[model samples]
Target: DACEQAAIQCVESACESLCTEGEDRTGCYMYIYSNCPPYV
Candidate 1:
């Protein structure tokens, strides 16, 4: 459960950071799901 939570947290933070950098937040979340490892 912690790992799942971590992934969720990671995506949320990463999405926000990407948005700040002018990247599409939804796309960034998708990218993370496709590219980032679970532990990341």
Candidate 2:
């Protein structure tokens, strides 16, 4: 759920900036989901 949190915790840029790119959202989500520990 931390990924979800990271996506939520940012008040401005961190999450919003990344997601604002549109289709790049897939890549952003994939990178975060992939880098997360296997057990997370």
Candidate 3:
């Protein structure tokens, strides 16, 4: 659970830092879940 929380925080940080618009940020989160099953 801690690892997942950390992963979520990391994802949120990356999305906030790298993405500009709302859809782009949402896409980043989706990409993470879709591509990084370890985190999902």
Candidate 4:
């Protein structure tokens, strides 16, 4: 749940800016999701 929340938070701020600027939302989501680390 923590990791998921962080993922959402990351995407909300980063994805919004990246997507709105010129990047594809799909790509941004995929990029961040792939890199989102889980809590151990």
Q: CA lDDT, every prediction?
A: 0.54, 0.46, 0.58, 0.51
Ranking by TM-score: 3, 1, 4, 2
For candidate 2, lDDT tens digit of each residue in 1-40?
2334454443233444556455545544555555644412
Residue 5 in model 3: shift from native, Å?
20
Candidates by lDDT, descending order: 3, 1, 4, 2
* Consecutive 10-residue window with the lowest summed lDDT within model 4: 1-10
Q: Which 10 consecutive positions of candidate 2 have the poorest summed lDDT? A: 7-16
Model 3 agreement with the true structure over 2-31: per-residue lDDT tens digits: 333433565656665666656766767666
lDDT per residue for candidate 1 within 1-40, as digits (tens), equals: 2333433565657566546344356555666676677733
lDDT of 3: 0.58
What TM-score, to 2 decimals, does candidate 2 have? 0.35
By TM-score, who's the top model here? 3
After best superposition, candidate 2 residue 10: deviation in angstroms?
11
Task: Say what the RMSD of model 2 is.
Answer: 8.0
What is residue 33's positional error in candidate 4, in angstroms? 0.8
